[PDB]
Write a protein that binds this ligand. Structure first.
Ligand code: AN6
Ligand code: MG
Ligand code: MG
Lengths: 276, 271
């Protein structure tokens, strides 16, 4: 019977909270939080007292049923995360789905979002964009993920940690090339806030100039691929290379052209250039 | 020497304004908005006076003012500014001119709708307003039919029925769609259901299509198992050339299909 509230929290600047959020927090009986201690400190700063429930992804589903039962009893539950808004790389998906399928009102509240905040000042097209969150921590997985989105024409939003910023930048340089334009937004809404846009190679070089520039939390905005059709499809080239490894060059090119339905002369020229 | 500020505005709830935004508005001596009337009404409700600037080149004037040393705050009618509209060129020019841009967190209709829709969020794409023309809308839907990420669109009450019919025609009926209406207000309503069921539900009453809407559509992540004729012909061609096992592996890696299936199919054909 009681409604669930998705109340965002500041992303580092306490002053960046909404009045409605404070009223809702003081008007609810239980607050599901990623880390009770953290939220507890935030509540104390505003002089708000309420019950805290440890709700994180590890025990999300397990306690989703308990939260649903509590809501059915007429209680009001507000969901908060350490920062930004829940459900965006933060726990809450299973609980929200269970509440929705059980016929429970869900009241979302506007609030801070690191990706949106970075995009607003990114200086890049915002009409269409794709959010991807964190990148794989492994080199092979990261390279595969980057390759899969190499041809994406929309602006790309990624989340990044100081622990792997240099490796991720190097992988981006290797895959997407240094010509791509990338914007790094660090410590938004904080004293050391800094947004720097540049070619990937230039960006990397600038970051390596000082360790201070890769400290804290970061968001990466990658300009989408340009609308150039001169380059032939990469899948055809990969198939041609694999068939060359397994079969003779001429048969490999003929089979690749036949399956992909592309001109054989261009594929043969590319293969000859690669071999040379 | 001046600093540009991005100050998101409420989206239909005056209580959704943050303290930092109010302090920034007081601090800046010139506020630039697209719709002067809306921002003026917001300021009067908050009892704020300032030198409003109207947007319609204005980029050069704003850059000159910023270079002079005047703090300018950029605002929009609702939500976060410079989203689904031009203006990012000005931010890029200011960054290239040594100016410092301070974004402020604020309301976002798409993010707010996504946080409550319950559809997957680990990865999503925002497509903004769909084409107002039926042919354009159908072409856009076709271009994103195979997208596996959750899609977020903005729609107006005028074309909500047309958009729903277009999605029904293109994406079919089995697809799950969530409609968010009048978020952050007494009329807020989020309803999730198949496209056809949602269309019937919205047609059942007129108030359900009143205002501005946010549409969240789950990506295509089902019925991906099949045996395309291209894979079969490739396997047949490679079998005569390479050993069955090698041909099956090559076909599987080319078409991204299970190798063991192709092998069983080849054996059944041979049999
Ligand atoms: C792009 C122009 N945009 C401004 C929102 C801002 N740009 C933002 O990013 O949040 C206007 C569009 O956003 C949607 N919208 C705004 N407020 C809404 C609300 N309370 N409920 C539902 N939808 C809403 C709706 O589709 C409207 O036509
Ligand atoms: Mg922790
Ligand atoms: Mg968290």
């Amino acid at each position: 019977q009681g409604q669930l509230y998705i109340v965002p929290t500041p992303i580092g600047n306490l002053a960046d909270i909404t009045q409605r959020a404070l009223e809702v927090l003081q008007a609810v009986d239980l607050i599901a939080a990623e880390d009770t201690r953290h939220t507890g400190l935030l509540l104390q700063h505003f002089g708000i007292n309420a019950r805290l429930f440890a709700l994180h992804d590890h025990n999300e589903q397990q306690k989703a049923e308990t939260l649903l039962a509590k809501l059915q009893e007429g209680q009001n539950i507000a969901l908060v995360s350490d920062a930004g808004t829940p459900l965006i790389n933060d726990p809450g998906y299973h609980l929200v789905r269970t509440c929705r399928e059980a016929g429970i009102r869900v009241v979302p509240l506007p609030g801070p979002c690191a990706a949106i905040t970075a995009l607003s000042a990114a200086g890049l097209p915002s009409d269409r964009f794709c959010y991807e969150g964190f990148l794989p921590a492994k080199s092979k997985g990261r390279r595969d993920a980057l390759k899969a989105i190499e041809a994406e024409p929309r602006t790309l939003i990624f989340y990044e940690s100081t622990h792997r910023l240099l490796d991720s930048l190097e992988d981006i340089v290797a895959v997407l090339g240094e010509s791509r334009y990338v914007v790094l937004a660090r410590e938004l809404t904080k004293t050391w806030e800094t947004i720097h846009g540049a070619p990937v190679g230039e960006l990397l070089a600038w970051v390596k100039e000082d360790e201070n520039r890769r400290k804290g939390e970061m968001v990466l905005i990658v300009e989408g691929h340009k609308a150039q059709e001169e380059d032939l499809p990469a899948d055809a080239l990969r198939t041609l290379a694999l068939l060359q490894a397994e079969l003779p060059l001429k048969k490999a090119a003929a089979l690749a052209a036949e399956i992909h339905g592309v001109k054989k002369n261009a594929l043969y020229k590319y293969a000859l250039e690669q071999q040379g």
